[PDB]
Enzyme design. Structure first.
Site, PDB file in Angstrom:
ATOM      1  N   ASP A 124       0.775  -1.236   0.000  1.00 30.61           N
ATOM      2  CA  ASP A 124       0.000   0.000   0.000  1.00 30.61           C
ATOM      3  C   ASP A 124       0.816   1.302   0.000  1.00 30.61           C
ATOM      4  O   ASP A 124       1.230   1.787   1.054  1.00 30.61           O
ATOM      5  CB  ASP A 124      -0.905  -0.024   1.230  1.00 30.61           C
ATOM      6  CG  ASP A 124      -1.965   1.040   1.196  1.00 30.61           C
ATOM      7  OD1 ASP A 124      -1.795   2.033   0.466  1.00 30.61           O
ATOM      8  OD2 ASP A 124      -2.965   0.880   1.912  1.00 30.61           O
ATOM      9  N   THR A 125       1.015   1.880  -1.179  1.00 36.42           N
ATOM     10  CA  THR A 125       1.767   3.122  -1.308  1.00 36.42           C
ATOM     11  C   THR A 125       1.053   4.301  -0.661  1.00 36.42           C
ATOM     12  O   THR A 125       1.668   5.327  -0.402  1.00 36.42           O
ATOM     13  CB  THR A 125       2.025   3.483  -2.791  1.00 36.42           C
ATOM     14  OG1 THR A 125       0.779   3.534  -3.497  1.00 36.42           O
ATOM     15  CG2 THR A 125       2.948   2.457  -3.441  1.00 36.42           C
ATOM     16  N   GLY A 126      -0.245   4.156  -0.407  1.00 37.67           N
ATOM     17  CA  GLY A 126      -0.997   5.235   0.206  1.00 37.67           C
ATOM     18  C   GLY A 126      -0.925   5.233   1.723  1.00 37.67           C
ATOM     19  O   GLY A 126      -1.398   6.165   2.373  1.00 37.67           O
TER      20      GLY A 126
END
Lengths: 198, 4
Positions: A124-126
């Site tokens: 999850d880059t967010g």
């Protein structure tokens, strides 16, 4: 362009004739934007995330420009704490995760080993932090709360935790709590040399 | 906090 994850992967987007900043979020199936003015009709909808659920307005076939790259798709508008570009649009702009290249037509899942246990998690880059569903972990922890799309959740914070993500070893902070899914955040993604490319 |  290639982007490292030492900082939040923010991009400039143009939608509905307005300019905004948004987070490239590999952990998001869809795109959710803070309240804003958009033309046409929408459909009531509820989406989930950490913290719970939020009601949003669903706009389909909306033209969006993400850092110059054009894409048309569904955009949800609601009480999200951060504008995020989900996979529905990331695929349209040829976004890939590299750490072993990975397209985003499917959730970027990985196998991890932590606390002697094997689990599946979402790259999850967010997410700034790594959050895992309740599990047995060795050592001491400290109470902590984290927010998300649906609000906040109480989690147990463990520091200096050794974790293996698809064979790659990393040590960092791991939060354990009421998360709807195990997510590997940027604090650990940076260690496995993860990059976003589009 | 936060995580998306």
């Amino acid at each position: 362009p290639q982007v490292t994850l030492w900082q939040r992967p923010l991009v400039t987007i143009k939608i509905g004739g307005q300019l905004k900043e948004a987070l490239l979020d590999t952990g998001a199936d869809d795109t959710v934007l803070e309240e804003m003015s958009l033309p046409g009709r929408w459909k009531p909808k509820m989406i989930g995330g950490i913290g719970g659920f939020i009601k949003v307005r669903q706009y389909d076939q909306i033209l969006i420009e993400i850092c110059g790259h054009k894409a048309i798709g569904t955009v949800l508008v609601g009480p999200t704490p951060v504008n995020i570009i989900g996979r529905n649009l990331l695929t349209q702009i040829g976004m890939t995760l590299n750490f072993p290249q990975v397209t985003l037509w499917q959730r970027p899942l990985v196998t991890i080993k932590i606390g002697g246990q094997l689990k599946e998690a979402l790259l999850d880059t967010g997410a700034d932090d790594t959050v895992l569903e309740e599990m047995s972990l060795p050592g001491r922890w400290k109470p902590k709360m984290i927010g998300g799309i649906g609000g906040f959740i109480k989690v147990r914070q463990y520091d200096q935790i050794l974790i293996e993500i698809c064979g790659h070893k990393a040590i960092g902070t791991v939060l354990v709590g009421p998360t709807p899914v195990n997510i590997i955040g940027r604090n650990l993604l940076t260690q496995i040399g993860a990059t976003l490319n589009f | 906090s936060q995580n998306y």
